[PDB]
Fold short afifavidin.
Amino acid sequence: QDMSPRQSAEAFGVPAVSSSWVNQDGSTMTLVFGAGNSVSGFYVNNAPGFGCQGTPYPLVGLTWGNFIGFTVAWDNATANCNSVTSWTGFAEAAGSDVTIVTDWNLAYQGSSSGEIQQGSDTFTLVN
Amino acid sequence: MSPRQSAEAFGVPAVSSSWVNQDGSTMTLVFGAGNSVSGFYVNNAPGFGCQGTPYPLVGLTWGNFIGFTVAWDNATANCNSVTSWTGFAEAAGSDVTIVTDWNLAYQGSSSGEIQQGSDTFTLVN
């Protein structure tokens, strides 16, 4: 009874196994639903005041129903910001639109010792 | 990046490690290729459904930084919700601690909600 990739995407509230999104800062991401409640994809940060912008970083997570969680480690071939971010949240469908309401935490190296910064991102489905 | 090197860099001298948080919740972390962590989590925290049964976890690390997610769905119990943790490991002698913050996305009183909390994990072996 493992949910198919397509069943998982439908439960989240999107038509296809892959979906494109944009947040309030114009950061973009693509989500790919797989077997085992799996979430894969990539993230492109556009948020002012952050490093590691404008290039894709892998994301991995899990999902159940309209709930999701996923992590991005800020290392790729182009740059490194020695940090990790996770998002957790819920999808809301309305008409032909979907939004994901998330909260995030970011683990990074403070000027002294490890620190965890927090925020919220709202993502809308790009059709 | 190889598993053991990732695990090392996190502060554990082994690809497989077991942890327990302040409330008695347990998890096993396996460092895989690249930046991957995979394992299982047993929630023994007061007041949550889905106690005492193992759920898959997945995440990524970089250095002593980690993020991982658990969907509260398995064959025993479904709590229609997901939790992610994000934090950092600190090593003292052969002790290793993970300080994390977590978010739980769930179906609240009248709509989706996100509850926040903090877990500290210690390395057991």
